[PDB]
Design a binder for this molecule. Structure first.
Ligand SMILES: *[C@@H]1O[C@H](CO)[C@@H](O)[C@H](O)[C@H]1NC(C)=O
Lengths: 105, 52
């Protein structure tokens, strides 16, 4: 995709303390910690077709906040599913957890 | 439906598959533990097709 011509309804300025570069907060370079936009989070159905080039590899992740408060105040609604689908890969993720220990602050 | 013309025998020593056969699962999907089933069904000494 493009960075700013494919997600116009989802802020992508993903900040995190643990992923600091030189004392300033940041995130990964190959991924994008979407956090909604304008106090909402529209249901996205973005796709891609590997008809061009060769056997490409695709990377993604799901974030499990450490409490219901982060879910409610960040994605603005609980019970959020992630369902990647392809010809031979159609499993779903339903991350809903309310506690964790502390690792790497 | 395309594979119902099989030779309905009773016992076999090893099954045979065409390399990448065309008419496999007519409905598209994922066969869970397919490889385990294939390894188990490789040999059978008595194969009585019942209906539960
Ligand atoms: C993003 O929001 C606008 C309205 O604000 C809407 O027209 C557009 O369809 C949305 N994006 C997608 C991919 O649906």
């Amino acid at each position: 995709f493009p960075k700013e011509s494919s997600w116009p309804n989802h802020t992508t300025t993903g900040v995190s303390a643990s992923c600091s570069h030189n004392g300033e907060s940041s995130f990964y370079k190959n991924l994008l910690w979407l956090t909604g936009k304008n106090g909402l989070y529209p249901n996205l159905s973005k796709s891609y077709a590997n008809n061009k080039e060769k056997e490409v590899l695709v990377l993604w992740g799901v974030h499990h906040p450490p409490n219901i408060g982060d879910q409610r105040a960040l994605y603005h609604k609980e019970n959020a599913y992630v369902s990647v689908v392809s010809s031979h890969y159609s499993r779903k993720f339903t991350p809903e957890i309310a506690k964790r220990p502390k690792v790497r602050d | 439906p395309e594979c119902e013309l099989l030779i309905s025998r009773e016992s076999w020593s090893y099954i045979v598959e065409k390399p990448n056969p065309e008419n496999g699962t007519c409905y598209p999907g994922h066969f869970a533990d397919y490889e385990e089933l294939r390894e188990q069904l490789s040999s059978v000494s008595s194969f009585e097709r019942f209906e539960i």
